[PDB]
Amino acid sequence: SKREAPDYYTFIKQPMDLGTMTKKLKSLQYKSKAEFVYDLNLIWDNCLKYNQDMNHPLRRMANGMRKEADKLIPLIPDITIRSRAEVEAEERRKQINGMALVGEEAAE
DSSP states (O other): OTTTOTTHHHHOSSOOSHHHHHHHHTTOOOOOHHHHHHHHHHHHHHHHHHOOOTTOHHHHHHHHHHHHHHHHSTTSOOOOOOOHHHHHHHHHHHOOHHHHHHHHHHHO
């Protein structure tokens, strides 16, 4: 939220976190797997960039989620959404205390 990080849009011109994906689900902004791969890569990069502090448990959590992405990405095929018209035409042409406690538990 702009209130939380007013400089986010000034620093990070590409807001993209789980909230952004959840917003995007019902608006048809997906073509192939590489899109989401880039999304998660930039998510990691932005999380590192905004808080340059290496020792923040937020980046440890980000590393955990990156490992999870590596684990459970293989399922998705690289299928591109081709409109039936395009395929038919081609065929025809062919045819902060809470955060502190969370960090403490992550360390423990």
